[PDB]
Structure formats: C-alpha cells, structure tokens
Amino acid sequence: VGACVLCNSQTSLRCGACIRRPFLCCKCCYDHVISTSHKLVLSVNPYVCNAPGCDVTDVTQLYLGGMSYYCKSHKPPISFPLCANGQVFGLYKNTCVGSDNVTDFNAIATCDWTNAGDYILANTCTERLKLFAAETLKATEETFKLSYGIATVREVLSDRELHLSWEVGKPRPPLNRNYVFTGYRVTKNSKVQIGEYTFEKGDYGDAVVYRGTTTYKLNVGDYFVLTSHTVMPLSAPTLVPQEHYVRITGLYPTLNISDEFSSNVANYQKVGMQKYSTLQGPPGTGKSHFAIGLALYYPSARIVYTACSHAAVDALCEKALKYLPIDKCSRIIPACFDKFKVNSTLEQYVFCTVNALPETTADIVVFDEISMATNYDLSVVNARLRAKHYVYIGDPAQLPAPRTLLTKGTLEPEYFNSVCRLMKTIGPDMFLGTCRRCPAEIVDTVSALVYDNKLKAHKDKSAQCFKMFYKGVITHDVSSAINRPQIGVVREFLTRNPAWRKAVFISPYNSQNAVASKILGLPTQTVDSSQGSEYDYVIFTQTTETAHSCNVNRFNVAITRAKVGILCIMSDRDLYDKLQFTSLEIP
Amino acid sequence: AQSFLNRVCGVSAARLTPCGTGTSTDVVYRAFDIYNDKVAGFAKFLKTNCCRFQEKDEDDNLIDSYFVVKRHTFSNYQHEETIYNLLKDCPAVAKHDFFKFRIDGDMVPHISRQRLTKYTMADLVYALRHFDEGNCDTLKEILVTYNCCDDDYFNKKDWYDFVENPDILRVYANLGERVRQALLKTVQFCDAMRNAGIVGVLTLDNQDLNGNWYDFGDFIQTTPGSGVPVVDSYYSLLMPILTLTRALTAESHVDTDLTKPYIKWDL
Amino acid sequence: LKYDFTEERLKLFDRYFKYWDQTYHPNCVNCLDDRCILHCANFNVLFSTVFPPTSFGPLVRKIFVDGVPFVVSTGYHFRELGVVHNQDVNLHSSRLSFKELLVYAADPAMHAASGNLLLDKRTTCFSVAALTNN
Ligand SMILES: [Zn+2]
Ligand SMILES: [Zn+2]
Ligand SMILES: [Zn+2]
Ligand SMILES: [Zn+2]
C-alpha cells in the first residue's frame, strides 16, 4: 500500500526479485516484470500458484483460478491471467498511469555496482530513483561484507598491539583504514559486546595497532567480529532546495568581528541569506576556524557540528575548547571525545556524527568532508535535520569515499555524491581565503595543479620540501605493499640529515608503512586517514605509481599536511615534472 | 600545594593533615589479589599512587578516616565517573568525587574517596591466613583499633596460642559483627550491580573494613537488569575466617539483636 | 510476604484429623484424580479460614524485557487449590509478539501496581486499589 517508486501512483505491489521491495503500480509493475528477470511480485498475497506441490512463481504464467493463483497445470476450468493488458490485476487497476524512466530502474535493479557506469547512473538518475539506488547499493554492500573471520584476540602486547588472530580458513581482513570491528567478551555463560575499533597494520610482523571508542582496557579472549548493520528506507532527497533570502532570516548579526575569523566574516553574511552555503574548502585551511568563527558570529543561532566519523569531530572539539564555551555545547556519542553533554538535542552547539544524531531541527548545521559522504547519508541527514541554513564543508579535490565495490573505472570528484556534483557546476558559495596550514611551497603547486591557482601562497618558499627521483622496484603479496629498494633508499636518505627522524612515514598501503616502521622506525600515516593530522616534517614514498596512489587530489590532501617540509619519494614523472619542489637524486 | 588540599577537602569538615607530602604519592605495603594474564596470585605488594590524608577530629586527635586521592589517565576518569554515576544509590558504595587539578601546567584528573578505613579486608584475611608471631604488627593494630583488647594484652606470652591461653577465642569474638555487616553490604552491592547491568568481579582488597566499596575500573556495561557479578574468589578466600571469628552468633538471638534473649526453640 | 503456609496446613490436619485414613495433599496439583481433588479441596476450604486474607490471589514477579522493568503474574494462591506455578515463564526477552501483548494487557498486575491505594468504607468486601483520581 503506497505510491509506486516509478509513478507515484498508489499501488500495493513489490517486486519479489528486488531485495528492497519497491512499490510498483500495475502498469509500471508489468513493465518491470517484462523488462528484467523480475518474475517475482509480492502483494497482499504472494503471486505464487498456491496449489499442492506447485512451484511456479512468475506472474505471466499465473492465472486467477478461483480464489487461488494457479498455473495451467493446476488451474480449474475457469482462470484469469494476472500479468495481462500491460498492467497486472490488483489494487486500483484503473489509475496506473505508467512510467517513462523504466530501463534505468531495471538497470539499477540488476547492476552489480562493479563498473564505474553503475555509480555514474546512481549519481545521475532522478531523485527517488537515486534514493532507491543508494538504498540497494547500501544493502548489497552490507550483505557482501559478511564472509570474513573472527578476530580472536591473542597475545596482547602493550596497549597498542593486541597481535590479534584469525579463524584459519575464512578471514580476509582489510585491517587498513576505517574498517570497524566490534569486540565481544564472554562472561561465564553470557556474552556482551565491548565497542567498535578500527584496527591498523602496525609495526613488524603482527604488532597490529588498534584504535576506537569504549575507553576500557583490553583482555585476551575478547574476540572481534566485523560489524554489520541493516538498511532503513530513506525518505528525504539528497539536498534541500536552495533559496536566497533578502535578509538573515531567523538570525541576528554579530556585535563584534573577530580578527582570525574576519576573513571568514566576509563569508558569514551570505550563509544567512541563502538556504545552504557550498564551500570548496581547501585541505585543512582553517575549516574548523570557519566553523568556530560562525559560532561566535551567530551566538544566538543553534548550530550542529556533524560529520561522517567522530575523528572529524575531534578537530571540531579541539577548536571548541579553543574558543567555544563548554556550557552551550553538546557532544553526542552513541554506545571518542565526550567533553560536552552526550546525546542532548537541546543545545546551542551540537557535536555528533551521521550515525547517532536523531531527528531534530536547528538554525544552521555544518557538515564536513562532504567528499567523504555519500548521497545515501546525504539524504539521511536531510531526513534527520531541517535546519534553517545548511553548509557543506569539503572539496572533492581532497579524497573520495572508499567504494570497495567499485572495481571497474573511476568515479569523478563531482560524481562522489550530489553535493560534490554541484561543487563543479555551481561551485562554492564561500571560500577559505587565507591558507591556515601550508606555505608557498605546497600551496603554489597544489593551486596550479587542481585548485585553479585560487589558493594564495601563504608563507615563504620552504625549499626543504624535497622531491625525489626514482624509477621503481616494487613487490606485493596478498594485501600488503612492500618496497624494499624504496625502504633502503629512504633509510640512506634519512641518514643524510638526522633531523628527518621526526618526519612521519606516509604510505598508500599501511603495510608499506609497517615495513618502514620495522626498518625506518617512523610512524604510520594513511594517505586516506590524513586529514586533520599534520606535521611540519613528513616523509612519504609513493610505493606504487598507480591511479590509487598517483591521482592528483590524493597527493594534494597528502601534501597539504606538510607544514614546513615534505620528503616525497615518487616513482612517476607526471607529478615530478609538474612539481616545482626542490629536486634531489636517488640514494 | 595547599589549594590542592583545600580542593580535595570538599565539604565535609576541614580536619585534614597530609600523611603524604603535598603532591607526592605516599607509598605503602599492602596485601593484594590480582589476576591479569601476565601475573596471578594473592600476596603483599607496594601501593604507590595514593596521596593519603588522614582526617582528624576535634582537639586535633586522629581517627580512622582517610581521604585517599588518586591520579590516573583521562579515559579512566570519564569511565569511572560514568559508572559511579550509575550506581550512586546503594548504601554499599563509599562516597566518591571527581575533579581535575592544576599542580603545574597539566590538566591531570583526580579521584577522591572519602571516609575510608586504614586497612582493607584483604589485609585482615592475609593477616590470619599467613600468621607469623615474628611479624604480627598489622593484626595487633587492627585488634587495638576497634577496642578488641587493650595493648597490654600483648605482654602475656602465648596470647596468640590456642592451646595455651584459650581466652584468645574470646578476643576474636569481637570481630564477627563487622564481618557479618560486610557480608550484608556485599549482598546489597551485588544486587545493585545486577539491577543496573554491570559485569565484573570483586576482591577483598577493594572493600573497606566497614563494607563500603570503590575501584570500579574494570566494570563494563550491559542491558540493565542483566548484570552478572562473579564472587567465587571473594567468598572462597574469606571462608575460613567465619568460624574462626564466630560471625553468625547473632543469628541465635531473638531478632538478630545482640541485646536480646535467645530464640526459645521447641524441644 | 509469606505466601506458602503448607507446613501450617499439615500441622493443623495432623493435630485435629490424625486418624483419617487417606492421603491429603495440601497442594491439589499433586492429586491423582478428581476424587482426590474434591477430597483435598474440602480440607483446604476448612483450613484457609485462619490465614490472613491479604496473602491470596495472584503472584507477581518483576521481569526485564529489552532493559525495561515489568510486573507480570506467574501464579495464583487459591483459597482451596493451594499454590499453582506457571510452567513456561520468560524472564528476559527483546520484543513481544501479539499473544504475549494480549496476556500482559489482560493481567491485573500493572493496573493494580500503577494505581493508588484505596480504602472503601461503604462496602465490607476487600478493596484493592483505584485507577483514576475520582
Ligand atoms: Zn524489481
Ligand atoms: Zn507505477
Ligand atoms: Zn500450479
Ligand atoms: Zn489430593
């Protein structure tokens, strides 16, 4: 009972072949049945021949034989075909108008979401078609990630390296990046979860580093299981309609303009005359400064600082304790940082994530790393918050979401989601003028590279940001990257200047950083998990020159973390000749 | 320095004298039971991070009331504060307090436990299950503290012998009621944890000599009303003391009242 | 809180009916047939005029479902059949079906507990509680 997802016409039927059970009206249901292998349709009664011992389920072969669906073998003398006249018999058989966008729905209902074209369709279809496509993609991705091992914790070394274990013939654990694992500790005869943890590659051979919430200790026998969830039918669209007001509706201007946020104050007015403000936020250039300056700019407006992961809200909390009074601040964390009141929608400043905040409505809500976000979550947030103003902090020239199912082709920075799609068509509305992190060295190169020279060269030319020439001798295994010639090269180069024994080692795959820390001793940094984390001295080796380690935005976000100097060892020349850095030889 | 003392002494009187040294954690030699992968056993140990402040009384006389204050990491601070917030109703929990002091340019957290006892249960258990006449200062102190006997009693030799001087039994008699009270409070506390959904274990070293509890470091959370305690080690270790001190002698009185006649049983 | 009284039943029956040559179960749930049911229920009717009246009726027991406190009924203490305990009782559960919802809504346990104390001086029957404030 409801409006069909292809016609908005009131129907009662759902395709049995589709996992998501989409409402389809008689005309559009018939079209979808005949357009794919969707011979299963669910209604008040499941469209199956309810005869003793029968198995036929297709609506085309089914006949309304009396008060029972029947095939030809089990039909009584009187029968009636359901799948007929281009509209299967059912509720409101007259008012089924039919649809035009049918084949896109069929391809959405049948694509495995492996080719890049599937995601192109997912980001280029109609509104509700895009919503349903995101729903189906989420369901498929969740049900795919349930064929792995149980991380039985054994030989806990210190408070970083539990050393883990696996259940022999099953585990395929991608310990890299944000792969959430929950821990279960068995007490007597009962068992109970502990909390989610991310896990990381870590030093040497099995000293795997962990990190997460649940500030408890750890114990042996607390086996970890890869988390899974359930999909909920989205309601809201990707983005609310945009309208520009003639005045700051519902807010009042500021009584004092702070100097550090004055450059952001020039953008703190137009956030108030439009429904939402789009920002091509440069990597780490005081986006948190913009957020806290807006908070101080509108102290009477109720603001929600939301983000995909809580580590993104970590910098928000840092800048909050920098300037935001603790009294009017909430830090919602489900069962990370908790220095505010937890799970309290009644607050001036609200800190939370996309997975824990319930339904609410504010005046302005900030949402960061919109490049990291997906249109599914971009609609979830709309189905949870109806704030007077929105703002989407994030530049698709920073990082994509890890679409692990995306195997064929690559997704464009605009095609990450809808808000990043308009990041190139309508572009930004405000912009972070002053560069709060990088000097002229990195800023000039990244601005001439992809930011269209709009990033002002902030500090002086570093001249310690060495670019290293190397050809490549690389070896790999099951899931780990190893570059022994590169490890030796960076060992030789690091010995030339002992001051570089503080530069963190960055790696496209954190197992290359693991073998480095086994030989180099420098800490590990994911090129993906690099935003926020920043150091004056950094050393990074490309390991491989492939698109997953040589795309422009990836190394942009990796290099925008170098405050003073970066030791970038690359095996390629597309960026080497593009880079205007200080060129050095090969150790 | 002194402002740290003033902050620690929150609202209850001001009769504190620092047994430690300002911000220095005084070290003590105490009995402990601990089992964590690397080590396991029940024997004496050296406690370090415990700034002890013995509260005195009017006329500057000392009394058994020690405002132990402990410093630790930040995650532990929040975890303990949450858990103590859950269970701050049962009369079996010693009063707690949470704040963060600035000894230097360091936001180090603090945890305050007020009106404790100088010795824990584990000390009393280990004092009798490991008796040695050559080193029995702790037992003498415990006995003289609660008016079990006068200190002059330790001059007549073989006071600690059973066969000679059987009066030693009548001295151990005046410790049963304390153990019975401790058992009652343990039952109350266990009921509270199972009510609010706590999973963990208990040990004699955490309970004072009045029954109050503390040290909720290793407790996890579940769905409320499904918390399961573990008490096998507690009871098994405490078990031999009960007959030795004659804990349950009150049960034969009219209404478990020491000032009441005997229950007149039918023949 | 006492609700068993089996020993007092046996005491009284032995003190006054010593030589009655027949098995008497104070709790009729152990009888062998309806003849035994009547024979035991007769004595039960005699004895239970001594015990206090407030200890008859349903037996409640607080249980927890998905971390929520509930007051249900697990048995009855009749004036003539003794004590009957429910066989299948679930202490902890996540979510309720329709039948369980129905049997819990029908029970007088929550309505009685959530109500207020009532003393009625019009009648002489045993009051329990009220539900509204008038
Ligand atoms: Zn379908
Ligand atoms: Zn339709
Ligand atoms: Zn058939
Ligand atoms: Zn009978």
From Swiss-Prot, chain A:
A ribonucleoside 5'-triphosphate binds at residues 281-288. It is found in: Host endoplasmic reticulum-Golgi intermediate compartment. Zn(2+) 11 binds at residues 4, 7, 25, 28. Plays a role in viral RNA synthesis. Multi-functional protein with a zinc-binding domain in N-terminus displaying RNA and DNA duplex-unwinding activities with 5' to 3' polarity. Activity of helicase is dependent on magnesium. Binds to host TBK1 and inhibits TBK1 phosphorylation; the interaction with TBK1 decreases IRF3 phosphorylation, which leads to reduced IFN-beta production. Zn(2+) 12 binds at residues 15, 18, 32, 38. This is Helicase nsp13. Zn(2+) 13 binds at residues 49, 54, 71, 74. Coiled coil: none annotated. Residues 1-112 form the CV ZBD domain. The gene is rep. It catalyses: ATP + H2O = ADP + phosphate + H(+). The lineage of its organism: Viruses, Riboviria, Orthornavirae, Pisuviricota, Pisoniviricetes. Residues 256-432 form the (+)RNA virus helicase ATP-binding domain. The chain holds residues 5326 to 5917 of 7096 of the full protein. Interacts with nsp8 to form the replication-transcription complex (RTC): nsp12, nsp7, two subunits of nsp8, and up to two subunits of nsp13. Interacts with host TBK1; this interaction inhibits TBK1 phosphorylation and decreases by 75% IRF3 phosphorylation, which leads to reduced IFN-beta production. LRR repeats lie at residues 227-247. Residues 433-587 form the (+)RNA virus helicase C-terminal domain.
